[model samples]
Target: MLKNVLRYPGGKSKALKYILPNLPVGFREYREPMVGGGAVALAVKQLYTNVKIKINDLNYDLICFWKQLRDNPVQLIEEVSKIKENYKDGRKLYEFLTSQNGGGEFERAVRFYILNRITFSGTVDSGGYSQQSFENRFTWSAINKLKQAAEIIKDFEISHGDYEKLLFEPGNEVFIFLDPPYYSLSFDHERFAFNIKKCPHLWMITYDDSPEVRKLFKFANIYEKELFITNYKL
Candidate 1:
């Protein structure tokens, strides 16, 4: 399985072991609308070489960064190496670069890359940088990770848009894996945009086990303690 380029807070890199084997047989297409960190999508692409894979995220800047890597890996790496690894310097550069406009897609991508690596757990709202000490910021292992991820995603159809639009697309042989944001303990479903009732074709939805989540999919076939839900019997 391939690793994500950034360290997302709720990334599904660890859950792939259960999710992949449980997928229904003979799914020709894989789609992930809320492709945060895209760990699952990347893993599926590596496992099923022939399957058509498409990934989308609402964050346009993040999408641009992925596209930048796919289209221009060498350039992206060059820009990434120039970034400061130190916490103080990295934070200052991140603030300055993000504030200004028109650095071209490559530069903006580099800034995003820096913020992700330098920030704490890749979380944005914390307003704090990573406290973990590092021996080297631009290690060959780090550079190669980005390069490997970029190469694997070159053929993927990445997009920037709402998740509902992608999930509702008409198709039968497609299998969409939905990983929406966590639901509050209050059972507020309003934060979610797509209605599971309207989803067409083979699909699986994943979310943390909660009273609301369990009740919402009470009728559906749930597996592994409410972590995965499938529309059909598996």
Candidate 2:
């Protein structure tokens, strides 16, 4: 299994063990709309090397970071490694990069990566320094993780757009996997389910396990499956 280089708040790396095995097969193309942390995509590509993979997300900085790493892993790692582990300095650099100042795309991407490392749970918004020790900031394993991530996604297609647009693309034998944001926050489940039901591709969605989420899919023609961390019977 492939690991994620960046830390995402709601990443599905842990859930992938269950999800990947249960995913439907026999598709010419695989698509992921939200693709945050890209845990699902990376795993799918690793397991099914022959199928075409496409990933899209709405976050510009996140997309840039991935694209930059894919195109220039050596240079990106070189710059990111040079960043000091000091939380105060890291925050300052984060502010400068996030602000509409004058940093280029590559520089901003580097700053975003550094800021995420220092922040708690990889959150880009309001948060304090990581509670862990400072030694975790720039470890050798971290550099290796980035290198592995970049190598895996070097030639895969990456884009920035709405998740709905991916469904309209002309393709046969397609499988779309969606990992949208939290329910009742940025997502409208009813409308999304309704739209995707008309598509000809095989698809599955992974989301938080809750009564509300389960109820929303009652009328949909999709099967609902709840996954746990280990061998716990339903």
On lDDT, the candidate that comes out on top is 1
Clashing pairs in 2: none
lDDT of 2 by residue, 39-151 (tens): 88888888888888898988777778888988888998888766653333544655654564446668767876776676767765646555451247546577768888887
lDDT tens digits, residue span 2-93, model 1: 66777777788888878888887899889998887888888998898898888998777788788898899888887677554333455565
Worst 10 residues of 2 by lDDT: 225-234
Q: How does residue 199 of candidate 2 score in lDDT?
A: 59
Clashes of each: 0, 0
Candidate whose TM-score is highest:
1
